[model samples]
Target: YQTSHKKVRFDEGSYTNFIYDNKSYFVTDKEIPQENVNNSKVKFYKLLIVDMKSEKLLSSSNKNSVTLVLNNIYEASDKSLCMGINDRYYKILPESDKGAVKALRLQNF
Candidate 1:
């Protein structure tokens, strides 16, 4: 079946300078039970946090910060989901290049 996915990347160069990457995948399947349209049984909706980057990604200075939100069920109805429940992945200076890119969320249908 034809599957569609969308990805959004937001960056803040105002402070420590960081980048956030968000992605969502949508697919069509006939397995989803008709009882629950919002819930998918076979193919329906999926969300993921692909990757994040910061100025310190390849630098020694760890002054970087990032945030990623996933499984955003709210997005199904509201566009303001981006404002709430913003999963954050950040790092302070001097350790920027050493820490993982915060935490990631993945959801499947």
Candidate 2:
């Protein structure tokens, strides 16, 4: 739940990209947070739940970064990232599957 310098960057990973309401989003690893890297290096530092985003920048600055205000994963999944919650946004494209970007929908029948 900590981010500020976070420009939605996963230092070592990339995924399918998309946008909602003119904002950008990117796919992420399921257990990004679980993965750790050298402080001098970087990782996604992804938050598994609560602050989860379908397209998130789980970048681990190792020493540089601040806490970013964000909405719950639910809202992000529904409407994707919004304003204020994240001021600095970055767009990352997926290298594997271009069509591998889509949040888990809650509008089930």
Candidate 3:
């Protein structure tokens, strides 16, 4: 008889900012089940968001929400943007900017 165990890697338990609708939103991974079977290739994880100064799991989907999965982050040249893998740059803005319209800006400028 053979026993197999399979597990999925999870992101660091730290809050990171993501820009949605020209606003700042923070997200963090909450948990990963330990009962995952070895044969399963797809892993569904829980994500939590800071909403209205409270932290709660993200359950509903919003059409305007932007999801970003990154391996690491770095400071950009401007000191306000973050550089992610694959030449992706994330802008850091105030939470009050949420639900605002995107401004006119050049790509990678």
lDDT of each: 0.25, 0.30, 0.34
Candidate 1 Cα outliers beyond 4 Å, as residue runs: 13-73, 76-83, 86-109
Best by lDDT: 3
lDDT of 1 by residue, 1-109 (tens): 9865433332322222222233322211112222222321122222222323532223132223333222222222211121212332111112233343332222211
Off by over 4 Å in 2: 1-25, 39-97, 104-109
Q: Report the backbone clash tally of model 3.
A: 0
lDDT of 2 by residue, 4-49 (tens): 3334432233323334334555533321221121122112334221
Global Cα lDDT for candidate 1: 0.25
Question: Using Cα atoms with residue i matched to residue i, what is each candidate's TM-score against the true structure?
Answer: 0.20, 0.20, 0.27
TM-score of 2: 0.20
Compare the candidates by TM-score and give the number of the best one.
3
Model 2 weakest 10-residue run by lDDT: 33-42
Residue 103 in model 2: shift from native, Å?
3.4
Looking at candidate 1, the ten consecutive residues that score lowest on lDDT are: 25-34
Error of 3 at 89 (Å): 2.4
Candidate 1 vs 3: which has more TM-score: 3
lDDT per residue as tens, model 3, 1-109: 8954333233333345444334544322221222221222223343433222233224444443323343333333333333232233343344465466342121222
